[PDB]
Design a binder for these strands. Structure first.
Ligand SMILES: [Mg+2]
Ligand SMILES: [Mg+2]
Lengths: 162, 162
DNA sequence: TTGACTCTCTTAAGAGAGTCA
DNA sequence: TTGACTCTCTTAAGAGAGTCA
């Protein structure tokens, strides 16, 4: 809403409803050939999602709260960071999944950063494979790997140099 | 074009006009504290761009050729890969800048892979900092680093556990 | 046959707000 | 008030295609 007290109330209510989302254990790559275990608080696949939660897209949800007869709305993963600066270096802060599990709402698996930083965690070698992220990754990153390139730098003639 | 011989003549002509683009020397991070040198063949900022070259967006260009009275057109950076498969693992092949310089049309700084592999290259540690791409990176990757996270994992209660 | 413009679209990470009941 | 839906937009990596002289 408006005050710091009102936000803390919004964050506390969010944490409590999310605290009751089913908890799925996931074993993930940490990098360096190591394995770790995370506990995700996953919002349901269908309705009902939990007091104050509604689905706005296939893997998009919003958290609603009517404070002083006036309704407020947030992206479902944003609420933990409501008292944090909303932009960084002129870029919008974004809810980043250290676990890369979209349905998950566990704030211990979420960080607040630029979309670029958010995206980049997808290719990181992970907490045990070289991760240099100030706010450390919880796991490797689904996209990390050799890649599957169809063709590298070619050339027919002799006009270019590296 | 249309026959493999005609696609080759189109690749040859594109190389020749791109070959005459201003060759800009860039000193870049390779990772592991190293500095390397990349030579970029940059398409002009405004018109004219070079025979067969037209701009369709801020940083988007196309190459055009009329073969047997029929006009043919391709994305600026796609021409080198015209005789290679256009998809991989059910994913479209895209022009990936190993130099991360969009205006550059030097084909020795380009690969043909999925949008994900393409994007992922922005965060790599570089050819001397740990790069594991089968088709190796020429530089570190503009986005690599500790990041700038505003807020990491947080909770106010005890509803959660990593 | 060409050049220089015009346009909308794709992907995945993410967001905003409106309609009913 | 609270729930369950509906819709389009943002951002960078990238695309195809139309007009006109
Ligand atoms: Mg993410
Ligand atoms: Mg690229």
């Amino acid at each position: 809403a408006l005050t710091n007290a009102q936000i803390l109330a919004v964050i506390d209510s969010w944490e409590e409803t999310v605290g009751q989302f089913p908890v799925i254990t996931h074993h993930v790559p940490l990098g360096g050939g190591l394995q770790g275990t995370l506990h995700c608080y996953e919002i349901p696949l269908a309705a009902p999602y939990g007091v104050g939660f509604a689905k706005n897209g296939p893997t998009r949800w919003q958290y609603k709260r009517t404070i002083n007869q006036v309704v407020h709305r947030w992206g479902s993963h944003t609420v933990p960071f409501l008292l944090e600066p909303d932009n960084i270096n002129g870029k919008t802060c974004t809810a980043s999944h250290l676990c890369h599990n979209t349905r998950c709402h566990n704030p211990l698996h979420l960080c607040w950063e630029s979309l670029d930083d958010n995206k980049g965690r997808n290719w990181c070698p992970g907490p045990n494979g070289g991760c240099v992220h100030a706010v450390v990754c919880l796991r490797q990153g689904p996209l990390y790997g050799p890649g599957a390139t169809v063709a590298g730098p070619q050339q027919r003639g002799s006009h270019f140099v590296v």
